[PDB]
Structures are given as C-alpha cells and as structure tokens.
Write a protein that binds this ligand. Sequence first.
Ligand SMILES: [Zn+2]
Ligand SMILES: [Zn+2]
Ligand SMILES: [Zn+2]
Length: 115
Amino acid sequence: MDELRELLKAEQQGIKILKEVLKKAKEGDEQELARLNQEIVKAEKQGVKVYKEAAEKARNPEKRQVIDKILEDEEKHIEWHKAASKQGNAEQFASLVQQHLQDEQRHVEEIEKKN
Ligand SMILES: [Zn+2]
Ligand SMILES: [Zn+2]
Ligand SMILES: [Zn+2]
C-alpha cells in the first residue's frame, strides 16, 4: 500500500482544472485561457514530479510500469497545450479538452481499475 491515493491527487487536480477549462473554453477569453493553460502546465508537471519520485521507489516493476506510462502521458498532455500557444483555440480547444478529460479518467482506471 504505497503511492496510490498520493498519485491520484495529481490526476484529481488535473481533472479539476480541466473542469474549469471547459467553462473558460466556452467563455472564450485569452486571459482566462492562458491562466488556465498555465495552471495545467504546473499541475500536470507536479503530477510528473510525484510519479517520477515514486518510480524510483517502485518495489515492483509493474508499479513503475503504471507510473512510467502515466508519467509519459502527463507530459504529452502539456506538450499539446503548449504547442497551441493560443491561435484561435475555443471551439477547436473544447473538442481537444474532451480527449484530455477522458484520458485522465482513463488514468484513474489505469490506477484503480474499479474506483
Ligand atoms: Zn494531464
Ligand atoms: Zn493521458
Ligand atoms: Zn493523468
């Protein structure tokens, strides 16, 4: 029983921000969007931090395997949001957010399976 609820905290935080991102995506404001983008970057990387930290303390390779997959995943998300750099991301943005949202929920399944 190690690094379970702790790691979920990262996903939970990311998902919680995504909820507001959905709101601001419909709002369509650069300041709100950039600020939220900024929040995402920090939150997801904080997730990477706890995952990477736990990875180097994985009693079982399978525990690292799950962490490593999400660790890679979580950075992938940021890379996408970073690559946007605000073009005209509103309608297009919301569509992509659905994927991030479904993905992090999948991360929960990858961890808990049945939560
Ligand atoms: Zn993420
Ligand atoms: Zn993912
Ligand atoms: Zn995640």
